[PDB]
Design a protein around this ligand. Sequence first.
Ligand SMILES: O=c1ccn([C@H]2C[C@H](O)[C@@H](COP(=O)(O)NP(=O)(O)OP(=O)(O)O)O2)c(=O)[nH]1
Ligand SMILES: O=c1ccn([C@H]2C[C@H](O)[C@@H](COP(=O)(O)NP(=O)(O)OP(=O)(O)O)O2)c(=O)[nH]1
Ligand SMILES: O=c1ccn([C@H]2C[C@H](O)[C@@H](COP(=O)(O)NP(=O)(O)OP(=O)(O)O)O2)c(=O)[nH]1
Ligand SMILES: [Mg+2]
Ligand SMILES: [Mg+2]
Ligand SMILES: [Mg+2]
Lengths: 155, 155, 155
Amino acid sequence: TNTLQVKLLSKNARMPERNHKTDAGYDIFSAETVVLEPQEKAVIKTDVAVSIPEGYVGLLTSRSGVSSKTHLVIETGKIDAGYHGNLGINIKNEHEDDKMQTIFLRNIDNEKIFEKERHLYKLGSYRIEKGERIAQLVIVPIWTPELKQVEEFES
Amino acid sequence: TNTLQVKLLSKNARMPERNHKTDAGYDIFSAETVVLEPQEKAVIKTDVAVSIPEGYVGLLTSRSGVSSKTHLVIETGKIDAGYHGNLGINIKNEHEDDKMQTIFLRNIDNEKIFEKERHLYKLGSYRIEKGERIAQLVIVPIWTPELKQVEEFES
Amino acid sequence: TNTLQVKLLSKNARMPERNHKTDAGYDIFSAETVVLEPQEKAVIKTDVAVSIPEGYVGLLTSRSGVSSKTHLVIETGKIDAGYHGNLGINIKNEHEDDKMQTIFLRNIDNEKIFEKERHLYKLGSYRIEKGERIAQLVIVPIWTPELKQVEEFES
Ligand SMILES: O=c1ccn([C@H]2C[C@H](O)[C@@H](COP(=O)(O)NP(=O)(O)OP(=O)(O)O)O2)c(=O)[nH]1
Ligand SMILES: O=c1ccn([C@H]2C[C@H](O)[C@@H](COP(=O)(O)NP(=O)(O)OP(=O)(O)O)O2)c(=O)[nH]1
Ligand SMILES: O=c1ccn([C@H]2C[C@H](O)[C@@H](COP(=O)(O)NP(=O)(O)OP(=O)(O)O)O2)c(=O)[nH]1
Ligand SMILES: [Mg+2]
Ligand SMILES: [Mg+2]
Ligand SMILES: [Mg+2]
């Protein structure tokens, strides 16, 4: 106990990292560079697996920085105990498609990505680089009792 | 203890079911067949009540399959201890209204619903059938202390 | 133990309040009157700080009433232990921008705000008043072990 196993599935993966000693969440990094157009969905790969013990659940969830600044919305993922597969970050660019163009992609701090080669993108598009802090994993204990069907409650 | 009471409110309701032994969430089924147009909201009825004991909270939340494949977004519901009412799934079709038509509704796996009778729908519309796994209930313990107002923290 | 410190940062702030004895969440009030146009984002200030102890995490999250009735979407905030700063409610008006006008703002119950002075707003705009129940704080215990890297899991 007091030990969580972590299995890196690739060279692109990075070990989960906790910001402070007091903090609750382990920050999670992307294993791939992805461009998301307005309204576009994706399951961004972490290339990290973990073995959550029985009587616990992981919460692969958004960071307040990224979610407040940008229209990148991560749907909180309920990481089951025993799931040793690749942790996917369930993400959607929730910026509106207003049929407008721009030479600037946007980073995860909602800042213009300057670049030498000029390219037209859809306005509201974002780019997430390889190995950026876009999510965090918070583990909490769970209650998994037997279900007893009843006609009325005892209270 | 180690027992959760479940009260079926209708013939349309189904008993909550856990997928595996190791898993954290009890999968929840719809009690009604619903069509959601783009941007349309609803509180889909489960027709299941539960008695969560004191010192716990239920999390009626999305499944990673349905949320990744489709624009159906369930807002996680905080199920209080003692709430013996009908569990509503708080859902919105977050697909954009782009003023386009199609003969195909979409199922919860983002697949075309073929049908003999031809009908025009709005593009991005979904249909959820009676008794489909669209949500899951994860129960976690909670901390409910007394609040003491202070001018500064003791740390 | 069984005591949470709460520090009001302003006269506009209100003490967090639990609805019932059995309930899990402490309801949180806005410290500022804010108008959110369609698609507009904000970090609405509570002007309340709290000292969550070690081995716990706060969940600053939406209420089922406000989220079901309106397109106001609060992204659940993961409140770390030791964070003594101002609690921001991470909110976005997820109503579509359909380029239409109206004389009516909308309140957090999705009801028309009548007013003597006539003003044109964008359709789907909301207003949140000073000191309205728009969020709730649920505290849960957490598991914060050491991470051990491994080539394969022990199971
Ligand atoms: O965001 C997520 C969510 C889940 N997952 C993984 C972890 C979890 O153990 C597994 C199953 O989660 P769900 O039960 O919520 N998905 P679903 O019920 O649709 O599929 P399954 O049939 O596997 O339960 O998917 C992710 O990688 N990312
Ligand atoms: O998605 C949900 C969320 C909540 N609920 C139920 C369970 C819970 O016990 C009850 C109250 O939850 P909230 O406190 O979050 N809603 P609100 O604070 O707006 O209303 P109330 O005055 O009842 O607290 O609503 C659902 O059925 N589905
Ligand atoms: O909705 C929120 C979410 C977080 N917070 C505060 C509480 C928490 O202690 C602090 C940090 O939360 P995150 O770790 O999720 N944000 P991020 O990882 O982007 O920044 P940091 O570098 O501070 O970790 O922000 C809010 O006030 N409102
Ligand atoms: Mg962090
Ligand atoms: Mg499942
Ligand atoms: Mg409440």
